[PDB]
Each structure stands twice: as structure tokens, then as C-alpha cells.
Amino acid sequence: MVQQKVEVRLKTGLQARPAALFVQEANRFTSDVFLEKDGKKVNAKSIMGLMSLAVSTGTEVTLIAQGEDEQEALEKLAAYVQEEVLQ
Amino acid sequence: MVQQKVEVRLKTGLQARPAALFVQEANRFTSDVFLEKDGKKVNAKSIMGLMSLAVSTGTEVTLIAQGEDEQEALEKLAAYVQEEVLQ
């Protein structure tokens, strides 16, 4: 048996389950939603799109919502992304 | 339209493409190969397994190989994970 400590230099992104639950929450709203980081914007109602953004836990991203209920959508989704969901 | 810069506290992991290439390389070896971090261990010959470990680009993890070709497996995969290239 052998082992070696290594630095992950490969690209990371949101894991599948939290991306899928983010989309379930976003689906409760009619607004379109996006995430953007460093000039790359993805459709936040797409699990594959969400997972494609290069992100690491603790990093900053910009959440964007546009539509009739955009204000409510943004508040719910910001809480979700920041792990500050209300009871 | 409304926007908000938020901190991503959700879990992240390897993206699909880099995990698929990791598995393509790992499957060539007879040794069992795992990635381990904070007491969680995943199979490096599994795309969904690799993607299930919480990691961020830059994070240090432990690569483990056990088997007849464990040394060559460790060497090949450590180079892959760390984005190291041949002279």
C-alpha cells in the first residue's frame, strides 16, 4: 500500500446534489436566474450550467435574477448558496 | 434585474470532464486507487465516486494505491491530479 499527499490542480465546481437542489428552489420562481464569476455567466436553472462554473467552497460569485418575482427569488437563492436558509 | 455577490458555502468537487479523464487513466491499473480527505475515501476509478469528495482547486488530498502496480499508479495519477506535464 502506498500514498502521497497531492495538491488538486484540477478544475472544481458545485457538486451535483447542491446544484440540483438549487435548481429545485429556483424552479419555484418564474424569474430567470444566472451565476457569474470572472466574465463567465451560466444559466442557474441548468444543473449542467451551474456545475460548469469554476468554483471552490468559500469563493465569491454573483447571483443574478430577472423576472416578475426576481426580488423574492434572489433572497431565497442567496440564502441557499450561503447556507443561511430560514426555517 | 437584481444582482448580489454571495459567498458559496455549498460543497464543491471535481468537475465532470477532469473526473472522467482521471478515471480513464486510473482504470488502466490493477491496483485499487482512492482519493481521501478528512476521513472520507472515494474510488478513483469511479467518475461519480471521485466527484463525491468535497474538494476545491488548491486543496491538499491523499492519493492512495494498493496492488501489484501501485507505484506506477501513484506516479501517473499524482502527476494527473497536480496538472504536471512531461518535459
Describe what this molecule looks like in 3D.
The complex is a heterodimer of chains A (87) and B (87). Helices cover 34% and strands 30% of the residues of chain A. By secondary structure, chain A is α+β, with helices and mostly antiparallel strands. Chain A has a single domain (1-87), classed as HPr-like (Histidine-containing Protein, Chain: A), CATH 3.30.1340. In chain A, strands 4-3-5 form a three-stranded antiparallel beta sheet. Chain A is elongated, with a radius of gyration of 15 Å. Helix content of chain B is 32%, strand content 30%. Chain B contains three helices and five strands, in the order E-E-H-E-E-H-E-H. A three-stranded antiparallel beta sheet of chain B has the order 4-3-5. The chains are: A alpha+beta (87), B alpha+beta (87). At the A-B interface, strand 1, strand 2, helix 1, strand 5 and helix 3 of A face strand 1, strand 2, helix 1, strand 5 and helix 3 of B. Strand 5 of chain A pairs antiparallel with strand 1 (2-7) of chain B. Chains A, B: Along with seryl-phosphorylated HPr, phosphorylated Crh is implicated in carbon catabolite repression (CCR) of levanase, inositol dehydrogenase, and beta-xylosidase. Exerts its effect on CCR by interacting with CcpA.
Keywords, please?
heterodimer, A: 87 residues, alpha+beta, Histidine-containing Protein, Chain: A, three-stranded antiparallel sheet, 3 helices, B: 87 residues, 5 strands, 30% strand
CATH class of chain A: Alpha Beta
Q: What percent of residues of chain B are in strands?
A: 25-35%
Q: What is the third-level CATH name, the topology of chain A?
A: Histidine-containing Protein, Chain: A
CATH fold topology of chain B: Histidine-containing Protein, Chain: A
CATH homologous superfamily (4th level) name of chain A: HPr-like
State the CATH class of chain B: Alpha Beta
Report how far apart the termini of chain A are. Answer: 47 Å
Q: Tell me the CATH architecture of chain B.
A: 2-Layer Sandwich
Find the structural class of chain A using helix and strand composition. Answer: alpha+beta
In one word, what is the shape of chain A? Answer: elongated
| β-sheet strand percentage of chain A | 25-35%
Oligomer state equals heterodimer
Q: Main beta sheet of chain A: strand number and arrangement?
A: 3 strands, antiparallel
Give the structural class of chain B.
alpha+beta
PDB class: transport protein
Keywords: Open-Faced B-sandwich, Phosphotransferase system, Swapping domain, transport protein
Assembly: dimeric
Entry title: crystal structure at 1.8 angstroms of seleno methionyled CRH, the bacillus subtilis catabolite repression containing protein CRH reveals an unexpected swapping domain as an untertwinned dimer
